[PDB]
Amino acid sequence: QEVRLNLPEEVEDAYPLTALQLGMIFHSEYQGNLSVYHDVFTYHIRADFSFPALHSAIQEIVQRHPVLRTSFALFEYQEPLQLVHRQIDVPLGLDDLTHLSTSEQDTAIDDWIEREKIRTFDWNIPPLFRFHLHRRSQDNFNLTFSFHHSILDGWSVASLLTELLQQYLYLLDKKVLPLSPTPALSFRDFVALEKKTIQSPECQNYWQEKLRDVTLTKLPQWSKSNQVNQDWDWLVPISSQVSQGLKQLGKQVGVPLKSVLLAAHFRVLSLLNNQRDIVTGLVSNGRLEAADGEKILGLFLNTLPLRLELSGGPWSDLVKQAFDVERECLSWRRYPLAELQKSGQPLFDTAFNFIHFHIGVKDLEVLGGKFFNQTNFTLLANFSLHPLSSQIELTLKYDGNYLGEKQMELIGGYYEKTLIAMATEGLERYETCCLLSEQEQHQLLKEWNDTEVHYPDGCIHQLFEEQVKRSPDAIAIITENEQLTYRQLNEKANQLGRYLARKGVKSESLVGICLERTPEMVIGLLAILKAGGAYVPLDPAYPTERLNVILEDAQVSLLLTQAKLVEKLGNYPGNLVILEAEQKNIALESPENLSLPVSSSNTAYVIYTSGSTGKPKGVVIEHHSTTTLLNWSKEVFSSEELAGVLGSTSICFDLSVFELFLPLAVGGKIILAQNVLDLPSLSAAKEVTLINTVPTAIAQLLEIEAIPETVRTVNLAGEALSNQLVQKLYQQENIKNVYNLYGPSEDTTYSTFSLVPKGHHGQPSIGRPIANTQVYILDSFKQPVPLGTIGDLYIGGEGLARCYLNQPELTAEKFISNPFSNEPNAKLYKTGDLARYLPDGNIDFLGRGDNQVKLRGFRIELGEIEAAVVKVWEDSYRNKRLVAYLVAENDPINTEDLRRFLGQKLPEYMIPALFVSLEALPLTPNGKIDRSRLPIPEIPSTSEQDFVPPHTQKEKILASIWQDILSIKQVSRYDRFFEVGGDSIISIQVVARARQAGLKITPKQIFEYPTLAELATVADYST
Ligand SMILES: Nc1ncnc2c1ncn2[C@@H]1O[C@H](COP(=O)(O)OP(=O)(O)OP(=O)(O)O)[C@@H](O)[C@H]1O
Ligand SMILES: *P(=O)(O)OCC(C)(C)[C@@H](O)C(=O)NCCC(=O)NCCS
């Protein structure tokens, strides 16, 4: 070996770094913040000092342990490797501050630590630590130890300080306690043992099987620590009683106490993620199994991805399966984390750690307990057993860039209440126990569902009849070829309703309707309602089968049709009321209002939808649910907005219930059209003050400048609403309100509403519930999810349907008992949609639960156009990546700028790798979109096989460096770092070999400018 013997005489030993050591420097120097894995421990001490014996005692310890004389040589050699220097002098800093009061003394000490912790170490120059003294009285003094975590774990520090203080007193004649020689020790024996382990096929295949089809999870983020600096420690109270009960539980189950505390961690993660399949890092203390193999100092840690599914059960079952998953991976535990995953595919967001441990002249620390230390984990649960009380306690160490105090306050409560339940009610089902704070329960369940409003009872047509009395000569409908006054419309609805009544239609009688969109259509609706029946909507502009499958399901009493559509019908064996055939017999009927004793609980209509697989399902909507919607709409929309409401939606769909009956309830008029795309070619387009449609259709009308300047409100509902679009609509200055509304057919037409602000930033929400409607975000066990967590959207209140027609079993499945109401009838409708709450109570709609897709990093959903459409193009790999479909407006967009812009705003696993610059996106009419008809892209390479543009704007030195460390021939200037096989651990030796080459770069600059092109510019010289 010409390296063993080509070492400085300074160095006596040399051996490579572990993947963790390189992982730690990677995190320490990821940016210039430089606070992670630089630990600073201080100690306030009543004693008699010995600044010479204290110093010499350090010299005894540093020569005692090679890791305490270790330098780092990163780039210069083949692999980064640790250089063990033969001996080093190490000073002890001193400050005298007796002249200051005790309160002033800690201000100046914390000031010293705050300065020291970001004061980086020079790896190549030993030692990787510093000591320091602050003098207060001749007996009060602070001793501070500042070190880098790549050299020492918390265990190493513990026994490092121990050997110290019994060689400090050794040189003091207080008690002579001789120190024993070092054992068969080597941090290399571990470094050598960890190398053997990376190439062992039994470790690789084991974790390959254990992690096969995991569901990775990121914690929810809706806050940051922009207030607290480095008090990123959250203290979770644990009382004496609860510590004892936690110990009792581990005895009863028969596992070590650590497995009880680990099960609490798993409980809160499942709660926070609404995920039963949970992965979290277990901090393992990989010491050499020989005796006196835990007295050697160094870094012996590996963090393993423990996987576990929370099916449910008593707490004791969760404990036992936390024990089962720990021994399961006991022997295979030294396989390093970096070899498990890849850079940018972190296996877990969080981690668990448990710290077991255990006179008057000096010895005792008076205020010696301040430990500053940070990891790279967003949430580390730092359990320990206090050495003197033997009581359990917990500190949540969190990443303020990812979790704020408004969030950590709730996380800490979840941990506190989880440990309460385990210690006191440790025999309940853990998946039903309420871990949410009393404050959070009230806000999620009460305050954000406080929508009760007392409206007049009654029916849909009663709202119309009353408006006829109040303005009988006002216009009710304007079609292309006629109008009708409120009296004129009413009198015909009475006449048709009487003819139907004397044909034999009464309460709960279903009469369908297949009519071309003319005023007889609305007359048909109103006459059916005025008699006391309920209409089943049919639209002649739809294929004949769709009509048949509904009539089949509904089995209607009789059908109102025109002579021109009976033909379209498959000879419905029931009674027909071919309208024009016997208009003569209509006209004999009275014009007076039928005043039948209709109940608001009678069915008003049966709206037919399709399930996920495509079966018919008729939604039975009562009058009171519709009147509640209309009465609420009276409050929200003005008379000037309701002056002319466009009737564009097919009555087969529930948005027609809003467009038709609402203007008739207030005095406005239906501006009737065949669809929203006929609006520009319509006579009364000038009269339209409100349109009620779907985002794509209003985009259609926007390109061609087809929105009448008299339109003052736009109601949007039915697909994803881009804030880019509401901002165009508001730019037409007459448009005064733009609403995003949500609601399944099972909850009448609308369930939630949001008056999307002008200039509003970010995703538009679907808002919060309308009058007499309640919303809940639950898990599979119908438990409310924490604020910000994704869950199933449930809806209750006055808008819920009776049932699915002729399908009572599906009705029970979808309309479940309401756990949050005492009322007898109280149901909740399972929407099948996912959602979460924004902090202000607004609801963030996340789509149906079925098509929410998957990938490593974190398996969740797409719908992230907020940055266009995203797709999943399954290729014959069955190994996949995210695809974009962009358009833009004028000049091209730097597609990479569109990724780094999202790098600091959106998570990396969600950020796609493939872009497509398009123009024409698919749509087969104005509603049905075709995801499967999106252009399958081509791999950017080929055509340019050995595509190698020369590299002349100082890529020169950068390309050199990539080439030497990555073993590839030469690089192209537009190549990406991670695609040519670079990772986090390699990013360091890229920064380092760029250092002596005259360039300063950060690992953060590598991960946001991974191309050799944009990385070369942000590179610096610094004279
Ligand atoms: N990505 C999104 N961002 C904001 N709002 C959305 C999004 N997707 C749907 N919505 C809202 O949901 C309401 C109606 O549900 P919608 O049919 O749009 O759900 P979807 O996600 O588009 O469809 P699916 O439920 O089939 O995934 C509309 O008000 C619409 O604004
Ligand atoms: P890159 O994306 O490959 O980065 C890898 C890593 C640095 C995140 C990882 O390999 C790593 O080293 N994690 C550190 C494990 C740890 O924190 N151990 C001690 C916890 S106190």
CB neighbour list of residue 152: distance below 8 Å, 6 or more residues apart = 39, 67, 129, 160, 297, 298, 299
344 carries a ligand binding annotation: yes
Whether the Cβ atoms of residue 230 and residue 35 lie closer than 8 Å to each other: yes
Task: Give residue 78 CA to ligand 2 midpoint distance, Å.
Answer: 22
**331 token code pair:** 């022997």
**Cβ partners under 8 Å of residue 1011, min gap 6:** 896, 974, 975, 976, 977
Ligand in closest contact with the CA of 927: 1
| Beta carbons of 882 and 914 less than 8 angstroms apart | yes
Task: Give the Å distance between the CA of 697 and the centre of ligand 1.
Answer: 14
Q: How far apart are CA 786 and CA 777, in angstroms?
A: 9
> Which residues make Cβ contacts (< 8 Å) with residue 804, sequence separation at least 6?
617, 618, 619, 620, 810, 811, 814
Q: Which of 602, 649, 955, 661 is nearest to 802 (CA)?
A: 602
Q: What is the DSSP string of 837-905?
A: E-TTS-EEEEEESSS----SS-------TT--EEEE---TTS---EEEEB--SSS---TTHHHHHHHTT
Task: Decide: 756 in ligand 1 pocket, CB within 6 A.
Answer: no
Residues facing residue 534 across a β-bridge: 510
The residue whose CA has the least distance to atom 18 of ligand 1 is 719
| Experimental technique | X-ray
Any atom of ligand 1 within 6 Å of the Cβ of 747 = no
What does the block give as tokens for 575? 């009674």
How many CA atoms does the CB half-sphere of 500 hold within 13 Å?
A: 37
- Report whether 276 contacts 270 (CB < 8 A): yes
Which-ligand-closest: CA of 340?
2
396, 382 Cβ separation under 8 angstroms: yes
Distances from the Cα of 508 to the Cα of 244, 276, 529, 591, 708, angstroms: 64, 45, 10, 23, 41
Strand intervals (E) in 65-208? 70-73, 81-85, 92-96, 129-135, 140-148
Q: What count of other Cβ atoms lies within 10 Å of the Cβ of residue 935?
A: 14
Whether 847 lines ligand 1, by a CB cut-off of 6 Å, is yes
Atom nearest to 342 CA in ligand 2: 3
CB of 751 closer than 6 angstroms to any ligand 1 atom: no
Residue 254 makes CB contacts below 8 A (sequence gap 6+) with none
C-alpha 25/C-alpha 986 separation (Å) is 11
Q: Is 717 in the pocket of ligand 1 (CB under 6 A)?
A: yes
Alpha-carbon gap, residue 987 to 973, rounded angstroms: 18
Q: How far is the CA of 202 from the centre of ligand 2 (A)?
A: 22
Closest residue by Cα to atom 4, ligand 1, is: 720
Identify each DSSP E strand in 660-801 by its residue range.
669-672, 690-693, 713-716, 737-742, 752-755, 768-769, 773-778, 791-797
What domains sit in the chain, N to C, each tagged with a CATH number?
11-181 (3.30.559.10), 197-435 (3.30.559.30), 460-833 (3.40.50.12780), 955-1018 (1.10.1200.10)
Closest ligand by atom to 843 CA: 1
Q: Is 6 helix (H, G, I), strand (E, B) or coil?
A: coil
| Residue numbers after which the chain breaks, C to N beyond 2.5 angstroms | 358, 867
- The DSSP result for 932-973, as a single string, is GGS-----S-BSBTT------SSHHHHHHHHHHHH--S---T
Task: Give the SS3 label for residue 926.
Answer: coil
Name the residue with tokens 């009688």.
509
Q: What is the Å distance from ligand 1's center to 721 Cα?
A: 7
Nearest ligand atom owner, CA of 863? 1
Contact 701, 723 (CB under 8 A): no
Amino acid at 425: E
Binding residue per annotation — 740?
yes
Give the distance (Å) from ligand 2 centre to CA of residue 86: 30
- H/E element holding 210? helix 201-210
β-pairing, 773-778 vs 791-797, is antiparallel
Residue 284 CA: which ligand is closest? 2
What are 507's two structure tokens?
A: 């309460």
Residue with the smallest CA separation from ligand 2 atom 16 is 303
Half-sphere exposure of 429 (CA within 13 A, CB side): 8
User: Which atom of ligand 2 is least distant from the CA of 987?
Assistant: 1
- Per-residue buried b or exposed e for 983-1005, using 16+ beta carbons within 10 Å of the residue's own CB: ebbbbbbbbbbbeeeebebbbbb
Q: At what angle do helices 460-470 and 655-666 cross, to 10 degrees?
A: 30
* Distance from residue 766's CA to the centre of ligand 1 (Å): 8
DSSP H or E stretch at residue 110: helix 102-117
Residue nearest to atom 21 of ligand 2 (CA): 375
**585 alpha carbon – ligand 2 mean position (Å):** 84
CB of 718 sitting under 6 A from ligand 1: yes
User: Which has the closest alpha carbon to 383: 351, 425, 431?
Assistant: 351
Cα-to-centroid distance, 743 and ligand 1 (Å): 10
CA-based angle 630:632:634, to the nearest 5?
70
Cα–Cα distance between 922 and 476 in angstroms, integer? 37
The two tokens of residue 521 are 């259509």
Residue with CA at minimum distance from ligand 2 atom 15: 303
CA distance 25 to 73: 12
Tell me: is residue 741 an annotated ligand-binding position: yes
Burial 347-382 (b: 16+ CB within 10 A, else e): bbbbbbbbbeeeeeebeeeeebebebbbbbbbbbbb
CA gap 185, 195 in Å, rounded: 17
Residue 570 assigned ligand-binding role: no
Token reading at 183? 């054992």
Name the residue with the closest Cα to ligand 1, atom 26.
848
All residues at 6 or more sequence positions from 693 whose CB lies less than 8 Å from its CB, including other chains: 648, 649, 655, 676, 714, 715, 716, 718
Amino acid in position 495: Q
Q: How far is the CA of 30 from the centre of ligand 2 (A)?
A: 12
Query: Which ligand neighbours the alpha carbon of 1006 most closely?
Result: 2
Residue nearest to atom 13 of ligand 2 (CA): 23
At 529, which helix (H) or strand (E)?
helix 519-531
Q: How far is CA 715 from CA 633, 695, 746, 967, in A?
A: 12, 9, 20, 59
Distance, in Å, from the CA atom of 39 to the CA atom of 371, rounded to the nearest integer, reads 8
Residue 822 DSSP label? -
Q: Is the CB of 766 under 6 A from ligand 1?
A: yes
For residues 546 and 569, is the Cβ–Cβ distance under 8 A?
no
CA–CA dist 562, 952 (Å, integer): 78
Nearest to 170 by CA among 63, 62, 295, 53: 53
Distance CA 776, CA 781 (A): 13
863 lines ligand 1 (CB under 6 A): yes
Ligand 1 centroid to 740 CA: how many Å? 9
CB of 152 within 8 A of CB of 297? yes
Distance 915 CA to ligand 1 centre (A): 23
Pick from 973, 971, 956: which is nearest to 1012 by CA?
A: 973
Neighbour tally for 849: CB within 10 Å: 18
Residue 788 DSSP symbol = T
Q: Are 620 and 447 in contact (CB under 8 A)?
A: no
Amino acid type, 1020 = D
CA distances from 366 to 109, 141, 155, 160 (A): 15, 10, 21, 20
Phi, psi of 428 (to 5 degrees): -90, 165
Task: Give me the residues paired with residue 355 across strands.
Answer: 384
Task: List b or e across 787-822, with b for residues whose CB sees 16 or more CB atoms inside 10 angstroms.
Answer: bbbbbbbbbbbbbbbbbbbebeeebeebbeebebee
Pocket of ligand 2 from Cβ distances under 6 Å? 19-20, 23, 26-27, 283, 301, 303, 337-338, 343-344, 375-376, 983-985
Atom of ligand 2 nearest to the CA of 351: 20
Residue 792 is encoded by which pair of tokens? 């199933």
The two tokens of residue 226 are 């922009």
Q: What's the gap in Å between 726 CA and the centre of ligand 1?
A: 15
